[PDB]
Structure formats: structure tokens, C-alpha cells
Amino acid sequence: VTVDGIEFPPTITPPGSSKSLTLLGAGVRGIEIETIQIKVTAIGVYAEPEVIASHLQKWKGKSASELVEDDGFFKDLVQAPVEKLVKITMIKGLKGSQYGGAVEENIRDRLAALDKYSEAEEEALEEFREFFKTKSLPKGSVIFFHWPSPSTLQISFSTDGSLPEEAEATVENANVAAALLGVFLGENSVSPSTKASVAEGISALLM
């Protein structure tokens, strides 16, 4: 499986973890320059297939096109209490503070909309901001977002693109954790391509 020349492995064990997760789908974050789509990142989404399948039973029989159009499906996915991992490979290089500010803005907008942005969420976003502050994210580098639990976010990163040995940082906050996942799979998604791919992955899995 490859996305814009970036191959996503069928499985990944999250940094520091023992549980092997399976690729559900992958896509890109696209931004436009005067109507032209530019690919900035490739995004791969991983979870435990047997396990996540058992929380999404209600969606069996539905095709990819049907899941894609159903917002409750992605909500289930986001909310499902199983281990998840998102692997992001940079296609255009960015400053960590740029990548980090963009994600933070997305999350904050989501928390605001849900009316779930209080002091705790602010402090968690600070930790998230702190992670990317002095980092550079060149072409080919990789960020790992790992949700061992829906309220626990573990982050790591390698300039190399190689798999970190361990998680570098942990952010403990249910709302921010879930909103970040939503950046990818949610109403607040930056990547319709990833969502369509994950839908196509899960559809096939449920049959």
C-alpha cells in the first residue's frame, strides 16, 4: 500500500508498545494554492482489526460509499475504545511550530464548537504545542500519534522516518485526544482521502 510514493506498512507496533496494529486506510492532507491541490502529508491510520471490527458491528453490510457519507460511522470510529495509531509522513517540509499550530487551531475550533474548551484542554494543547515548538519536520520525517486509550495521546517523531523506539511525550486529556483523532477521521478532518480509504478498509473488514 502506497500513497504518493509513500508506502504504508500493513502493520505497525506503536513506539514503546507490544500490540501490533493493522492499516485501516491512508490518504493525504491537501492544501490549495489558488485552486491547485498541493500534497503536504501522507496519513496512515492503524488499529487492531479483530477488536475494532467488534465495536463497529452495527455497520456491517454497508459499502465504502455508504460509510463515507455517514457521519455517525466516523463518530463511532473516533469514539471506539480500542488502540489506534496515526502515522504522518511529511511530503512538503514544515517547521514543527507550523504543523503544530495548524493542528492546534483545528482542535481548538473543534473543542470550541463542542463547547468543551476549558482550562484543562488549554493546558493539554500547550503540551502539544510544546512538543513541536523547536522541531523541524522535513520531507520524509514522520510523526506518530498513538492512542493506547481514547483519552491518552502518545506522540513520537523521527527526522529519519524510522520507527521511534519509544513514545517521546504523553498528553492526558480526553477532549483533546479525541479532537486530534477527529482531525483525521472526524467532522474536523483535514483529509477526505484518508477517511474514504479508512471507510473502504473497514467496509472490507466487516465482511
Using the Cα atoms of residue 19, residue 76, residue 150 and residue 9 in order, give the sign of their dihedral.
positive
- Which of the 8 DSSP states describes residue 59? G
Which residues does residue 88 pair with via DSSP β-bridges, in sequence order? Answer: 43, 143
Q: Which residues have a Cβ under 8 Å from the Cβ of 180 and sit 6 or more positions away?
A: 103, 107, 128, 145, 153
Distance between CA atoms of 173 and 179, rounded to whole angstroms? 10
Residue 115 backbone dihedrals phi, psi, to 5 degrees = 60, 40
Cα-Cα end-to-end distance for the chain: 20
Using the Cα atoms of residue 90, residue 93, residue 96 and residue 98 in order, give the sign of their dihedral.
negative
The correct answer on CATH 3.40.640.10 for the domain covering 1-50+80-184 is no
Candidate CATH numbers 3.40.50.150, 1.10.10.1800, 1.10.890.20, 1.10.10.10; the one for domain 51-79+185-207: 1.10.890.20
Alpha helices in 31-173 (DSSP H): 49-53, 64-69, 71-79, 96-113, 119-132
DSSP three-state, residue 26: strand
Distance between CA atoms of 19 and 48, rounded to whole angstroms? 8
Identical topology for domains 1-50+80-184 and 51-79+185-207:
no
Q: Which of 95, 92, 91 is nearest to 6 (CA)?
A: 91
Element spanning 201, H or E: helix 192-205
Residue 68 backbone dihedrals phi, psi, to 5 degrees = -55, -40
Domain residue limits, the chain: 1-50+80-184, 51-79+185-207
Experimental approach: X-ray
b/e burial code for range 68-79 (CB count within 10 A of at least 16 → b)? beeeebbebbbe
User: In a 10 Å sphere around its CB, with 0-12 CB exposed, 13-18 middle and 19+ buried, how is residue 134 labelled?
Assistant: exposed
Distance between CA atoms of 21 and 15, rounded to whole angstroms? 11
Q: Locate cell 478532518: which residue?
A: 189
Record the cell numbers describing residue 176, joined without a space: 483533546
